[PDB]
Amino acid sequence: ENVFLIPLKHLRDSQFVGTLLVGVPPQEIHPIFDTGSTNLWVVTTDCEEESCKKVKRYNPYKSKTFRRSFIGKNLHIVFGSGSISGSIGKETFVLGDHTVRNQTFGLVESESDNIFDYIDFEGIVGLGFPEMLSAGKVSFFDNLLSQNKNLSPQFSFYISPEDNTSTFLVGGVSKSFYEGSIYMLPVVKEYYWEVELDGIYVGEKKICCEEKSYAIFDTGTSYNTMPSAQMKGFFDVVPSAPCTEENYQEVLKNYPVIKYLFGDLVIELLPEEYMILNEESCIPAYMQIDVPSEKNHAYLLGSIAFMRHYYTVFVRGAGGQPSMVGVAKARAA
Ligand SMILES: *[C@@H]1O[C@H](CO)[C@@H](O)[C@H](O)[C@H]1NC(C)=O
């Protein structure tokens, strides 16, 4: 009932890419769905770099609906260990057989040791709030809702890379992806999907907090994060260890349980959820944001270290009501 599902493929490069149709006749791209940004980015045939040609570049000159901006524009965005640069235009998009017209987006013209030489990047569907927009005034999701008034203003993520059942849902939730009830956390500022965080314990060790702190739900980041000061204390109590696929469950049996405190809601992260196997070793799926950015004082919750265990729901606040993030135990299989 007004809730369509977008299957998310888990690529070898740790990406969770969906499907997005651009232009008319439509051209298929496989972007990531990122609550950590808001711009809509598409890799285009204007980018002649090696990391671009390896993917199915969108050709704007073969689309009847492409509308380049009247004025030449250039947008440069940082994307991890790399950067994205390009122009601005409008296009018709189709997501899950739902159309969005007159949508502003960035045309990747350059991707210049580079993160793009390791992934098959084809674009970004930003799901953050409009204040983070630098390409356009109306966000893709808001524009999708306005042109499809039958949809409830919410989306959710089910992350299950084991059986390739990961799914991005628009318009609501489905009991087939979570167990129990959904706990709603109010968003403190409509910019990131950011909520209050009362504390963090690794076992009995207090990691957070000494200042009033916040968590950010960031589907575009695989690891969880902590500020640099707290990351040092985390790694002092959570070690890496030699691991194989045949003993990782034994190695991690008595690792510490991580507790995130959201008021009265206690969110547990188990060792097999925040630890990952990498090069014959169990390593924690945690990192600090060493690059100066707007997120370096928050606690990011990512796809691998959080969303594998918890079904996440994102509700856009209507009128004065604030937006909220919902969390529930994901259902296996
Ligand atoms: C898109 O813009 C055109 C003008 O170029 C306008 O005629 C049309 O109604 C717009 N469509 C939507 C869905 O806003």
Residue numbers in the entry: 198 to 309, 316 to 536
What wording appears in the published article?
Modifications to the P1 biaryl region of the IPF scaffold differentially modulated inhibition of both plasmepsin V and X. Notably, analogs with potent plasmepsin X inhibitory activity successfully blocked the growth of Plasmodium falciparum in vitro.
A library of known aspartic protease inhibitors was screened to identify compounds that inhibit plasmepsin V from Plasmodium vivax.
